[PDB]
Design a protein around this ligand. Structure first.
Ligand SMILES: CCCCCCCCCCCCCCCCCC(=O)OC[C@H](COP(=O)([O-])OCC(O)COP(=O)([O-])OC[C@@H](COC(=O)CCCCCCCCCCCCCCCCC)OC(=O)CCCCCCCCCCCCCCCCC)OC(=O)CCCCCCCCCCCCCCCCC
Ligand SMILES: CCCCCCCCCCCCCCCCCC(=O)O[C@@H](COC(=O)CCCCCCCCCCCCCCC)COP(=O)(O)OC[C@H](O)CO
Ligand SMILES: CCCCCCCCCCCCCCCCCC(=O)O[C@@H](COC(=O)CCCCCCCCCCCCCCC)COP(=O)(O)OC[C@H](O)CO
Ligand SMILES: CCCCCCCCCCCCO[C@@H]1O[C@H](CO)[C@@H](O[C@H]2O[C@H](CO)[C@@H](O)[C@H](O)[C@H]2O)[C@H](O)[C@H]1O
Ligand SMILES: CCCCCCCCCCCCO[C@@H]1O[C@H](CO)[C@@H](O)[C@H](O)[C@H]1O
Ligand SMILES: CCCCCCCCCCCCO[C@@H]1O[C@H](CO)[C@@H](O)[C@H](O)[C@H]1O
Ligand code: NA
Ligand code: NA
Ligand code: NA
Lengths: 507, 509, 509
């Protein structure tokens, strides 16, 4: 049995090529990234937008059908994790700097400028579209992949790999053929690029925060390299439930502080308004394409919606693998519902607090927009409240933990996929994957410079385009696998044997 | 016998309110206004959010596996015929809200508009009226009635609100201070809700008698006489015990309501009404979750006063009526599945309300459009008769409207006094006559005080007081949601199969 | 064993219509216009309300416990392959409506707008097209087909529309005057709904021939020739009934439709079509109840003309096609679950329609936006050919569209004639050849008289006559809902248990 180097060599060489290209040819690299972004958006925004909603419909249908009763493993099998631990490690493994970066910038921006098909200065629209971007589509994508891997690995006992879940469509040989290796390579590439995007955004935010805190006058690239090296040493020392709990506690502390000291009643007013507007406008936002607003929503979608849909598909491999790991013995209905609704509620509360505070300030006359730097909005908001100077440090500690709870899980899963789904993989390969993620993030940030944000968005969309089709195909693979279950095999066989009525009619 | 520990606090608060209202009608009004402002500003979000959470919760309970549990033993058959059951359900749960706001509400929303929408929009008017009168209120009633029914029949506990919280607080908690507090809150909510209904009924009857020329001056003594008659009835009803007064008056209510609705339908713009019907339902389900999200931050944060006048007042009113309506619903729903109940309570009254508002609001809106407006001086109690006198043969339908105004009240305020006696006698099905009479007189008193104070308005005071009185019971209803979930999850049929999971969880480690 | 009592009433109505249309082309037009106005004004609410009630009803029936029943002997299996089954359902369910309104409808709504919305809105245009062509119509078909299938296979009753009403009127009623009336209404609706399609198809073929410049100028003789050809086919195709011509022609229909769709998709704005697709479904599902609640008094009360032209006409058209399409759907759905037939009928045709309207309406709208408008004179019968001639290699596609029109009509006309034969022969599967030929000739004659009358437009006359003829059958479908619920509830599997619950209720003391 040959070792799985056919999935290691291509990914390494591709990422090294990307690194050298981004270093030595910054202008050419940026031009190529922009051109690829334009092509991908123009030709596959429809695919992203359509299947974003098809995922949510598919997941609800699966949990409301006969398949919901199944359990992940042998019949009447019991779980191994407590419910509270299960959710605490669900939310903290599939989240990063997304909430901290776009907690304030997103609803405030949509309030100020508006969205296609709607006029500016509409709090309901701002909050509804934020909830759209952060509540049910993103976690439906994770639920589909996690459910597929959990079904493939526990009920059927296959190896813990993405290619395994495709066995019904392609067969065991196909799982071990070129197609399975291609799927694994695509998964690894998507993981690396998604995590690089997250690392870059988080580093930018930490740099802006340190600049605001007056520790540093101007954020230097050397500071970013130092931060990444510190993270490298930290995780290397590490190589988790404790860190997940710490993340939840720190996030709760910061949210509670802002809620108590900010406009409490306005936040609590925005809660029901946010949820109601979200479900009023759910399919009007899901049906938004480049042909809306007389064909003027292309740029907005490429900047906001398609970026998010590609971003959350980049993280689907390693988040889905983790969720499959931590969901042994749970029913399908319980997996799907925990995953889709607990993180959705957390995100709702987070965005309500921070977006509501920002919008209330913008209404009162005080402004935290400033120059419009998306990386300094959080710290501007905090410095607009008493005790912000001490909560900045808690925000920085949280930021750090949000990527260390995920990068830990990205590297572990990437090691797993490179060893035929072994529970533990080579430490050296894990270190190499961590270094690769760091290197990709750093080169993207440096190459982008002024346009670092846009460069990250373009690259993640390009890298995540291939895995959209993998996730689409995995829907059919999961359906076929669930249909062909031991419970219903005999019944469907009886119907198939009763298929002689067609022959009788032809007679 | 009688508790004597829930009665005394309740009577003390009622008498304090009465003396405050009569002795100092300016201080009372000022306090009511201040408390209303504070309550709205600090708990409108609670009212608005949980109004919708109730509907979601009850729909999920009906749709889930728990909707098969019968509200009796497993081999149980309903004791009431479906038509009689639903007739009593509607007659107990709807007082004078369809008569008072049948014409006023859609007409007001057409003329003035609604936050976040342009005026003179018939679809919006009808949709928001249906929002206020269809699903959200009967969802509250279904939750409370289901909790009490499950507590009393399937588990056999005492017929009280406290007994439904045994899952959360246990028997020692249901007999301690918390049980007494819940019973006192339930009694107070019932008294204040019924008093608000009594005040609105008295106002409407006075206006009607003015219109019909039976009495020239609607002075205070006329209102006292109206309340005295309205109390003598509804006290003889649950006292003489000469027969099935409750069922006979329920049937009379339904018959008179049908008669008046049919009259207006035939003599009014029939085709316009029938056009409104599908339009009303479509625009409702179109804007159902956009109205559920309307709050004090909507319309660029200027919708507070409108919500205080319309939505929060309604949500408090229906919450305050929840205790005794829920107890009655539990009473007449033995041996009915947890889904037949949750779908005969949600859907039948919602359809009746839809038809009622379609007919009356459509007639009013069509008259407004055609120039024969009936707004007059804007008195909410002078709309219906103003409408009725605008149709041929309507001069003799004022009397039927009054008879109907009365019957609606008598029927529900006889369901309320019976249940209050039951609560005050540790869950005795057949309450004491004297306790029933005392609660009826207390309700009448409170209604009279609320009406007399602030005579210039006489309507804002009712809304302020009912919101303030019903604020505490919102949390009781939410706790009822959790208690009901726990009690359904801990059924014997589910216990016998789920115990193995807990037993084997430790072994599997 | 011909009926001779259902045939004669239908024959005299058809002959009266033909004579009136031909010999008096002014009186017929005036009467049609007057009847259309009256019917719309007094029953638009009925059409609009029950359109959505049908969708809700069929969804509930598929979701409820009745979904598990099989439409055959217990533990029976389907007799037709799923792909062939669905191909036949789509090919018989619809004829020349996607070829006629594929381009005209979305383009018209994009240009002029719809009531309550501003013009030049792509989302609105697509959403309302989808509304007219996706869920409501196939819901009507599902209801009627399910009723007939359950009456015939599950209960072994006769294959008639009167038989499905046995639960409500009893066997003596099924052979009584009411059964005869229902059968006559079914035949009349079938004839007058198929004549509408024949007229539209002939008009479009004439326009296409004019566009191709095969004929110097169209004349009534060309229309008569086209109608005669389309009658010879569909009368020469039902004669044999042994060579399996219907399945082969259905497959040919699907193949040619796919070919034309693929050509337009590849050569037209592919990316814009693909952009519209998810946008279409989203906007449908957003404004699904906003459109369901659109009636004659929406948008300042000027939606009457638009509704009568578009939505009520569509509703009436599909209701008129319901008898024969439902009987055919029942015919080819033996031994399938109720849920599997209701999903197969509702969803696959809805998806095919969505894709069709995307590909064609999207191309038209994109051309409108670019300035290459295909509107021309505005005639609805040549928008498609203008569109095709606006694309490279669109000259052969003219001929392909013509053949597709022909096959479209033939596949449904054959089934209509066969079902009329079964109706006229007491539900015999194999009808007499002469009855089939006579009914085909009657359909052709009605189409011709409708087309000749009102020669200036010839389309408004078709719409008026279709609405008038399909009005009576709306109530037959509404009654079919109740009949179906009664027949499903009283099933053998449930009859053995609900008796216990009924007996226990009576002794509830
Ligand atoms: C004025 C207001 C009017 C409108 C009100 C509408 C709002 C809700 C009203 C209340 C409805 C409660 C329904 C709950 C289920 C009850 C039945 C049950 O136990 O079986 C369910 C079933 C359990 O399986 P089962 O045991 O096989 O069920 C059958 C039983 O065996 C038992 O079988 P049985 O033989 O005893 O038969 C019982 C019978 C009882 O059924 C009924 O009577 C329920 C009727 C519900 C439909 C609407 C109300 C109709 C009222 C009929 C009576 C009219 C009276 C007058 C009132 C109206 C006046 C105008 O049938 C059912 O069991 C009902 C099945 C429900 C199927 C789905 C219904 C939705 C249809 C949607 C059609 C439209 C499609 C396009 C949508 C486009 C969207 C953009 O579970 C499900 O399939 C789901 C149930 C829940 C469905 C509704 C959920 C809400 C709708 C979506 C809301 C939007 C948000 C969605 C996402 C969430 C986040 C936002
Ligand atoms: C989280 C809040 C912020 C929003 C975040 C995004 C999510 C938005 C949606 C939030 C609403 C969730 C509604 C509840 C979900 C279901 C929860 C659940 O577990 O409930 C039961 C799910 O039950 C259901 O059937 C769900 C029904 C949901 C109905 C929709 C909500 C009500 C809508 C009311 C308004 C209607 C009118 C509006 C029309 C426009 C579980 O039953 P079970 O399947 O475990 O039982 C076993 C049995 O075998 C089942 O047959
Ligand atoms: C251009 C547009 C093209 C696309 C148009 C199609 C859009 C697709 C969604 C339309 C909604 C109706 C689909 C068919 C109904 C359906 O899904 O059927 C199920 C039921 O579907 C529903 O209940 C969905 C209805 C949603 C209604 C939402 C609005 C609510 C209105 C107030 C109530 C019943 O089958 P089941 O698979 O549930 O089997 C039973 C199961 O085991 C559960 O017991
Ligand atoms: C824009 C306007 C919108 C208007 C919308 C109006 C919607 C109306 C939808 C009505 C749907 C009713 O569909 C419903 O189907 C279920 C299927 O089990 C039937 O269900 C019924 O079956 C039998 C009694 O007959 C019982 O065993 C069962 O408890 C009962 O619920 C109901 O008799 C029928 O009423
Ligand atoms: C404007 C017209 C009305 C539009 C309404 C849009 C509504 C969109 C959002 C749906 C959210 C569904 O959430 C799921 O519900 C399932 C039950 O259905 C649960 O099983 C599941 O757990 C839970 O996540
Ligand atoms: C505008 C604001 C709208 C807010 C909408 C929020 C909607 C919340 C809906 C909660 C529904 C709870 O349902 C129960 O859940 C239990 C736990 O899963 C089940 O055990 C039980 O069976 C079931 O009845
Ligand atoms: Na994390
Ligand atoms: Na009453
Ligand atoms: Na056809």
């Amino acid at each position: 049995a040959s070792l799985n180097w056919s999935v290691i060599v291509p990914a390494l060489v591709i990422v090294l090529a990307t690194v050298v290209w981004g270093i030595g040819f910054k202008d050419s690299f940026t031009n190529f990234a922009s051109s690829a972004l334009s092509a991908v958006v123009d030709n596959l925004g429809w695919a992203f937008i359509l299947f974003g909603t098809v995922f949510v419909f598919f997941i609800v249908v699966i949990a409301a059908s006969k398949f919901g009763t199944i359990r992940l493993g042998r019949i009447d099998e019991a779980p191994e994790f407590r419910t509270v631990s299960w959710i605490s490690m669900m939310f903290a493994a599939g989240m990063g700097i997304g909430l901290m970066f776009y907690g304030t910038t997103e609803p405030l921006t949509f309030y100020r400028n508006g969205v296609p098909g709607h006029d500016e200065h509409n709090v309901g629209v701002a909050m509804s579209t934020t909830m759209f971007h952060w509540t049910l589509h993103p976690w439906a994508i994770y639920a589909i992949v996690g459910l597929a891997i959990a079904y493939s690995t526990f009920r059927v006992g296959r190896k813990q790999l993405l290619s395994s879940a495709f066995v019904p469509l392609i067969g065991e040989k196909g799982a071990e053929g070129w197609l399975g290796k291609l799927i694994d390579i695509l998964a690894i590439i998507a993981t690396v690029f998604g995590t690089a995007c997250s690392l870059g955004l988080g580093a930018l935010q930490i740099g802006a925060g340190l600049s605001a805190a007056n520790i540093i006058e101007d954020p230097s690239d050397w500071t970013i390299v130092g931060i990444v090296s510190v993270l490298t040493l930290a995780f290397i020392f590490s190589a988790i439930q404790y860190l997940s709990n710490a993340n939840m506690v720190l996030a709760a502390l910061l949210a509670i502080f802002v809620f108590v000291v900010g406009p409490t009643v306005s936040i609590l007013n925005l809660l029901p308004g946010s949820i109601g507007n979200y479900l009023s406008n759910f399919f009007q936002m899901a049906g938004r394409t480049a042909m809306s607003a007389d064909g003027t929503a292309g740029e907005w979608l490429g900047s906001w919606t398609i970026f998010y849909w590609a971003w959350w598909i980049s993280w689907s491999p390693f988040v889905g693998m983790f969720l499959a790991r931590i969901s042994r013995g749970r029913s399908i209905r319980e997996f799907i519902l925990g995953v889709l609704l607990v993180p959705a509620g957390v995100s709702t509360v987070w965005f309500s607090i921070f977006g509501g505070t920002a919008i209330v300030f913008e209404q009162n006359g005080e402004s935290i927009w400033g120059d419009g730097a998306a990386e300094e909005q959080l710290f501007g908001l905090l410095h607009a409240l008493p005790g912000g100077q001490i909560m900045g440090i808690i925000a920085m500690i949280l930021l750090g933990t949000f990527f260390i709870t995920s990068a830990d899980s990205a590297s572990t899963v990437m090691g797993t996929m490179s060893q035929h789904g072994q529970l533990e993989a080579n430490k050296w390969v894990t270190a190499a994957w961590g270094v690769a993620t760091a290197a990709i993030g750093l080169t993207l940030l440096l190459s982008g410079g002024d346009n670092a944000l846009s460069n990250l968005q373009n690259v993640t969309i390009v890298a995540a385009t291939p895995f959209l089709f993998v996730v689409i195909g995995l829907m059919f693979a999961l359906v076929k696998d669930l249909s062909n279950d031991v419970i219903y095999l005999e019944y469907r066989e009886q119907q198939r044997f009763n298929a002689r009525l067609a022959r009788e009619r032809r007679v």
